[PDB]
Design a protein around this ligand. Sequence first.
Ligand code: HEM
Ligand SMILES: CC1=CC[C@@H]2C[C@H]1C2(C)C
Length: 465
Amino acid sequence: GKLPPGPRPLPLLGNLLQMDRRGLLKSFLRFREKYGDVFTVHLGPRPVVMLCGVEAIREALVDKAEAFSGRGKIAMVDPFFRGYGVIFANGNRWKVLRRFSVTTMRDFGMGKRSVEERIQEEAQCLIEELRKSKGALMDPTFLFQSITANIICSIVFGKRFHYQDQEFLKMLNLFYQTFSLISSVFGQLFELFSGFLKHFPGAHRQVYKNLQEINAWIGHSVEKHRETLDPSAPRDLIDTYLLHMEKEKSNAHSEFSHQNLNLNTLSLFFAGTETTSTTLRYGFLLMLKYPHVAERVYREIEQVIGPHRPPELHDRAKMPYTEAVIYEIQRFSDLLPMGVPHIVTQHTSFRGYIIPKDTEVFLILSTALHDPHYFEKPDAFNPDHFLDANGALKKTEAFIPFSLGKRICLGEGIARAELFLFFTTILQNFSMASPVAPEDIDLTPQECGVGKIPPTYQIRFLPRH
Ligand code: HEM
Ligand SMILES: CC1=CC[C@@H]2C[C@H]1C2(C)C
């Protein structure tokens, strides 16, 4: 007959005075200690229901999908997206854009040989690039974004960009900076008080500007596509979308609008770049801290693939250890600890509580990923979390870094293909070194809000034999 219980709110400030200084996620984990897995927190002026643990998350996202499949806002980027694009769309717009983005990504490769080939080709470009560096120290963030960006680029814009291209590097810089600012301490505070803080200067202004600058670059590329469009042969997703615009042009309410074009494309480009690159960033940081694991990965590569033939997706079933190491890098690095917010789309009863239409819901994915019933010592990096006694791969229903249900990550198969191919192709050709001894490597994220973002680091890729 009411919302889940939770800390007693003030007017105006919500549960501000009961929050933890270290961030939203910490705040919610202390609430979970007292209230259990289903609780309400007032983030400024509104109630947000928190769902923790795989059972509650799955009960909401899979058994009540008719109710929990709506998308809430992220205060820091809503002023830009405004419900346009597949990530932030709702209702019929999401239905159309979801169907479209999934389907046309497949058209042009996703989950087919074509994208595997694109990934393998891109890994060969990376390797050639790392060879040219001749064991120099770099922060590899730029290359990890470039390779993941070039995969989604080949599908969306019909092309890849060269690693040396400054205009490309500029977009990458903007995705990196924006993800950090969104995840910053200011970005968390903005989630609570955006109604008041938007009137003043701050990072929300910088994120909107960055986004608009990415939007412009995407505008120019859309114009180029418009000029050269061949209706009998679309080259990529922009062309296919442009064809949908025309087919539907007599309907003033068509979802295939120009704002959806720019913002859906931006959504895909952003998500297709920054999620996988950040994961890899933690992977190599993790490798540096646990060189024994890197070594054991390389032994497997030697034995299953050898030193020269390039890794392919068919290699996965025969490399349980590397696959365990990648699962554990995903579990540990916990990209979106609170997922992306949802919002129930009708009155729903959940475990005896009534959750009104339009209440926001955070599914704390992190609580599934750190569940001590599924992972012993969930705070430590340990690939044994994903292996049985025999050394065979052990998958678990608690492994939900892409979430579940109707809004489940639509790039899951791509991201898994990229993580395996890029991780193994790099390790087959190179070992890693850095100036910081493994004992002294700090894994503490540089930001932790919407995104968990690893700290910067230097690394060397040393060629084998
Ligand atoms: C390690 C890599 C990735 C992780 C951990 C990840 C994680 C997630 C999560 C947790 C969600 C939210 C699902 C929900 O709201 O319940 C999401 C949504 C989404 N992701 Fe991924 N993602 C990754 C890679 C990708 C890639 C490579 C792409 C694009 C090719 C992509 C595109 C999207 C899109 C478009 C959505 C919104 C889906 C919708 O709202 O219907 N992601 N992702
Ligand atoms: C799916 C997402 C990946 C990264 C950040 C959070 C969303 C974004 C706002 C595009």
